[PDB]
Design a protein around this ligand. Structure first.
Ligand SMILES: O=C(O)C(=O)c1ccccc1
Length: 361
């Protein structure tokens, strides 16, 4: 009989690498037995490319007949996987951020779960903070994709009532070498602050370009930057950046017995043991937390059916939907039939880069 099989596609190369590489390194830390059954992981790089991710998913689903699919790392790469997983009646744990991946619910997103808090929650929280600082004019640059646009649309809708105006809607593609034209346009609007909607190492470019061209005001980013690689590459230019993000990023500033510190230690300890003592970045935890949900669902699913059958996959899908009051590294998660993300505003923590580390603001 087939053991439990988990397929993973992640953006281990391409402009998503700072997200997918940590995920690739987390695979070796994942549990090799659950509910008394062996678990085998099949991990594939999708190169930050939606076409390759779809190919990976179809191979994992049709050839390996995986019980659960996990991925991808990025929103554009993950979007096509929704239909593929639903058609295959296989749960998909996406590791990307945009709300559209699971919300609003529909007959396909019934098959999809999402541990990273929906970007609209984060956008609302950062918008409120920006308003509180007294900023009245806020520049904007973000990725020309559904991740970036999810930030722009929520900020733009909230701006009027918050009491500031978005002075631009500049965009760039993740691999672009330059954003000089966009940054010059932003600077010409003489804003009080600038918002950047980006992720991974590409997020450094617009912030450095703004600083190099004389912008001295506040710069806000997103939880796409919550990797120490961003701090290292960005240096003094990213000092002081603020974003709305996850408990994981603020955990060192929470009480010692906080559940968030406990769930972080479990991940960090396992990751270090599998990776020669190297500390993980947050993006690996999106794989880890996804597997927490899957692991929690498997024992009940095993009472219903054997691994490798549609009935087992359906039981996993049914069970994750019932998960309640669960502290993940990503926040306090409560799944429902209509909410396959599981978070509210209590999941949004304001993070600041201070002295080269992520801190609670
Ligand atoms: O969703 C994405 O495209 C993305 O860049 C991201 C940002 C933060 C956490 C997970 C994915």
């Amino acid at each position: 009989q087939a053991e439990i099989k988990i397929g993973i596609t992640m953006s281990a190369s391409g402009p998503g690498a700072a997200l997918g590489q940590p995920q690739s390194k987390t695979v070796a830390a994942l549990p090799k037995e659950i509910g008394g059954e062996k678990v085998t992981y099949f991990a594939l790089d999708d190169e930050s490319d939606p076409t390759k991710a779809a190919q990976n998913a179809r191979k994992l689903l049709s050839e390996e007949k995986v019980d659960v699919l996990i991925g991808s790392s990025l929103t554009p790469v993950s979007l096509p996987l929704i239909d593929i997983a639903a058609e295959a009646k296989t749960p998909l744990m996406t590791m990307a951020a945009a709300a559209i991946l699971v919300a609003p619910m529909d007959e396909r997103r019934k098959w999809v779960y999402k541990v990273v808090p929906n970007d609209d929650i984060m956008a609302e929280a950062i918008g409120k903070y920006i308003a509180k600082t007294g900023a009245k004019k806020v520049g904007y640059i973000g990725f020309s994709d559904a991740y970036g646009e999810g930030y722009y649309k929520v900020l733009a809708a909230a701006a009027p009532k918050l009491g500031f105006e978005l002075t631009t809607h500049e965009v760039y593609a993740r691999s672009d070498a330059s954003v000089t034209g966009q940054v010059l346009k932003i600077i010409a609007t003489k804003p009080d602050a600038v918002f950047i909607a980006s992720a991974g190492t590409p997020a450094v470019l617009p912030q450095k370009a703004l600083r190099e061209r004389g912008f001295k005001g506040a710069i806000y980013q997103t939880h796409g930057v919550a990797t120490e690689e961003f701090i290292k590459l960005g240096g003094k230019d990213v000092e002081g950046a603020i974003f709305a993000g996850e408990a994981f990023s603020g955990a060192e500033d929470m009480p010692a017995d906080s559940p968030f510190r406990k769930v972080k230690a479990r991940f960090v300890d396992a990751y270090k043991a599998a990776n020669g003592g190297a500390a993980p970045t947050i993006f690996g935890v999106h794989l880890w937390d996804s597997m927490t949900l899957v692991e929690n669902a498997i024992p009940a699913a095993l009472k219903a059916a054997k691994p490798g059958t549609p009935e087992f996959r359906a039981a996993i899908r049914d069970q994750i939907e019932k998960s309640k009051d669960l502290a993940l590294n990503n926040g306090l998660s409560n799944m429902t039939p209509d909410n396959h993300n599981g978070y509210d505003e209590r999941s949004a923590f304001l993070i600041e880069i201070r002295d080269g580390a992520f801190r609670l603001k």
